């Protein structure tokens, strides 16, 4: 069976350095010719390098965004394929693949399941967690909504739970947005009875593993 | 480079019905009577997955309702019919020559009928006030299609580049999406002004919603 695996990805500052790696297997690598593509916080596909064979002269190629700071090479001994990144910028965040072939004509192709690499000034910090308290205006109909504002937390990714996760029925926690200042936000909502708001406790329970923080907050009407 | 014009951005698409995805070359693809364009489908998380490789061939295992078609700069993904699992991402990829280069990408949703948002507004916790800044969340829950105008107003000021909205994904059983917008001022800009309103339109309300709060007002 064949696999890719890359490795190699991680936090980095601008201006700064990582080297990504991919390893192949169950395949005649040195027969292949290997890209580096990657896939923006937005989810789209760029290629970023290629790299061909020995009889090729070990032809190398490179995205205009990223020629003269990355650098693809090969070890056929090893069936391996690396990127040297240097001089890093946040446009460089994103998941990096590595695969083959791409190029040319061919009835099948081979994927890695990525490496992830997030370019930023930013130090890793826990979010504060601020409630978004039901309104004391009625609704309509009898159903509140209240939830958590995640705010100003790095790197990617935090989870959210409610009550312990013994409420899960009508949550929405919204994707992060990466906010001006570099750190990111998201809310966390869910709809509830409004007969319950004076019974029922309401508390979201917001993990964030870069920091190793938990942070519970109980939501009540102000 | 052979830049690849992908359409449309978003299609929904009621399953059991065919899901039309296209690609435009700024140049040919192709070389001898092989058009060298290929799509990929990539679910959440996981690597794209190729479906159709050289225009027109199903790549092996990959289900009979893909089929692949066009030649030149002019190219089509067909699905049909379409099954709830092939809500992802989709996108055209052009192989005949370095820099390879790829479509913008299709996400490719289920569609169903109107619903319409349900509105609610929030306003900054007296806890995030004191530390300079404020946040005013307006959220639309549960609603289709996923087109809404959402407009904030101080003080009947319509804002502008300083509010950030955030959609779920598809729900996996009603097929609805929830929306938020997060308006963000400093502390003082927030208590310079008295009434804060977001007003949203959206197909399944007869008249667009305002919902609005008077600043600190319980």
């Known amino acids: 069976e064949v696999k890719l695996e890359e490795s190699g990805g991680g936090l980095v500052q601008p201006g700064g350095s990582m080297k990504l790696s991919c390893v192949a297997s169950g395949i005649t690598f040195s027969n292949s010719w290997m890209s580096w593509v990657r896939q923006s916080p937005e989810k789209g596909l760029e290629w970023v390098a290629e790299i061909r064979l020995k009889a090729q002269n070990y032809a190398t190629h490179y995205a205009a965004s990223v020629k003269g700071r990355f650098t693809i090479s090969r070890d056929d001994s090893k069936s391996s394929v690396y990127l040297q990144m240097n001089n890093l910028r946040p446009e460089d965040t994103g998941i990096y693949y590595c695969?083959?072939?791409?190029?040319?004509?061919?009835?099948?192709?081979?994927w890695g399941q990525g490496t992830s690499l997030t370019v930023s000034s930013a130090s890793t910090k826990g979010p504060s967690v601020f409630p978004l308290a039901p309104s004391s205006k009625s609704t309509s109909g009898g159903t509140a909504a209240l939830g958590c504002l995640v705010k100003d937390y790095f790197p990617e990714p935090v989870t959210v739970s409610w009550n312990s996760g013994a409420l899960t029925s009508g949550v929405h926690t919204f994707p992060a947005v990466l906010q001006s200042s570099g750190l990111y936000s998201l809310s966390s909502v869910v709809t509830v009875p409004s007969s319950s708001l004076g019974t029922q406790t309401y508390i979201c329970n917001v993990n964030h593993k870069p920091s190793n923080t938990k942070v519970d907050k109980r939501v009540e009407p102000k | 480079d052979i830049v690849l014009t992908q359409s449309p951005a978003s299609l929904a698409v009621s399953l059991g019905q065919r899901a039309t995805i296209s690609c435009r070359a700024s140049?040919?693809?192709?070389?001898?009577?092989?058009?060298?364009m290929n799509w990929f489908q990539q679910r959440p998380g996981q690597p794209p997955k190729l479906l159709i490789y050289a225009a027109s061939n199903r790549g092996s295992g990959v289900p009979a309702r893909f089929s692949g078609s066009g030649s030149g700069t002019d190219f089509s993904l067909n699905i049909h019919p379409m099954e709830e699992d092939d809500t992802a991402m989709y996108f055209c990829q052009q192989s005949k020559e370095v820099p390879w280069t790829f479509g913008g990408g299709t996400k490719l949703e289920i569609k169903r009928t109107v619903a319409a948002p349900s509105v609610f507004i929030f306003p900054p916790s007296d806890e995030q006030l004191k530390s300079g800044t404020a946040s005013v969340v307006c959220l639309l829950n549960n609603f289709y299609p996923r087109e809404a105008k959402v407009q904030w107003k101080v003080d009947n000021a319509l804002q502008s580049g300083n509010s950030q909205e955030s959609v779920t994904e598809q729900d996996s059983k009603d097929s609805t999406y929830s929306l938020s917008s997060t308006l963000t001022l400093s502390k003082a800009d927030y208590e310079k002004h008295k009434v804060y309103a977001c007003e949203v339109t959206h197909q399944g309300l007869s008249s667009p919603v305002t919902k609005s709060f008077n600043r600190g007002e319980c």
């Open positions: 140049e040919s693809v192709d070389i001898y009577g092989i058009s060298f």
């Open positions: 695969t083959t072939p791409l190029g040319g004509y061919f009835d099948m192709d081979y």
